[PDB]
Design a protein around this ligand. Sequence first.
Ligand SMILES: Cc1ccc(NC(=O)c2ccc(CN3CCN(C)CC3)cc2)cc1Nc1nccc(-c2cccnc2)n1
Ligand SMILES: O=C(Nc1ccc(OC(F)(F)F)cc1)c1cnc(N2CC[C@@H](O)C2)c(-c2cncnc2)c1
Ligand SMILES: [Cl-]
Length: 287
Amino acid sequence: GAMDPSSPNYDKWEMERTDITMKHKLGGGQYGEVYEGVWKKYSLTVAVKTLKEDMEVEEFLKEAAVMKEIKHPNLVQLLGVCTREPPFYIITEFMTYGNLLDYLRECNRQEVSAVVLLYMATQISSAMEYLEKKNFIHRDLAARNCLVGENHLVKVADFGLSRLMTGDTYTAHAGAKFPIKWTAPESLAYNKFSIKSDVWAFGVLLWEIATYGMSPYPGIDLSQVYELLEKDYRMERPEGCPEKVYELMRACWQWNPSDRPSFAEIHQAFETMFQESSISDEVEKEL
Ligand SMILES: Cc1ccc(NC(=O)c2ccc(CN3CCN(C)CC3)cc2)cc1Nc1nccc(-c2cccnc2)n1
Ligand SMILES: O=C(Nc1ccc(OC(F)(F)F)cc1)c1cnc(N2CC[C@@H](O)C2)c(-c2cncnc2)c1
Ligand SMILES: [Cl-]
């Protein structure tokens, strides 16, 4: 019996399907085959990713394998899998306040002050410093791919949104759907993805936080983004953004990937930046 520790077929991550009470599809279908679920014995709400009827079985099992290798307070936590027989499940913890992009756009601003936005950026930088140390690449870092929990807890996730999301967030490029405005120039021009191209996307994500979720490069056509960046254009400093924070965005957006800071340096910069000074005072001064 594969479920017993004695079994040489035992996998600690394999869970009993009957332990999960499957409820409705999450967020009106914005996540594809992801369902709200209840883990019986723990009376815990969970998020359950499944596969839609009938080659993507290998991508799904690869995601399950990657998730078993990663553990960080700011990375969505794997709780278990149902991969012995179809339908295949990936179970994670449910995050009360849902995705960060909608959260930023809908939040009460007296609550989600400059101090809270700084904490959210710092948490994301810690999750990314861990992925950098473990030699992983995210590939689609953005606010739409982060979740918000209790007490402004932020977790980085990866919802595989490219072929699910409606609108112009992701558009056709190199035979796939790219989020052009978050994509490092070497990723668009030379198909080069690395931790440094995640650094570039982090700079865009920082700008989303700094604007309460505004869409980047507003009013600029997607056909013009590469050319503008290649000619040294960069998004202007958001209104009220502290200069030290914008300096960090600009460092993320160096044309040469090798010139961008590592996530360890970005994380260290957030800790040091306001160790003595108040971000609240810097924002008030800027405004
Ligand atoms: C149910 C599930 C299944 C799998 C995943 N997976 C991930 O979030 C993830 C995170 C990091 C990696 C690391 N990886 C490194 C390699 N590169 C190329 C890709 C990323 C992989 C998968 C999340 C979830 N969780 C999830 N999914 C969709 C929506 C929600 C959700 C929505 C609202 C409230 N609470 C939770 N929660
Ligand atoms: O706090 C703010 N900015 C901030 C930036 C970085 C930062 O560091 C972190 F690391 F990124 F988190 C922390 C805070 C802030 C305050 N007031 C705003 N106001 C817009 C005009 C009035 O309404 C006040 C805006 C604004 C709103 N919409 C679009 N752009 C900017 C933003
Ligand atoms: Cl990887």
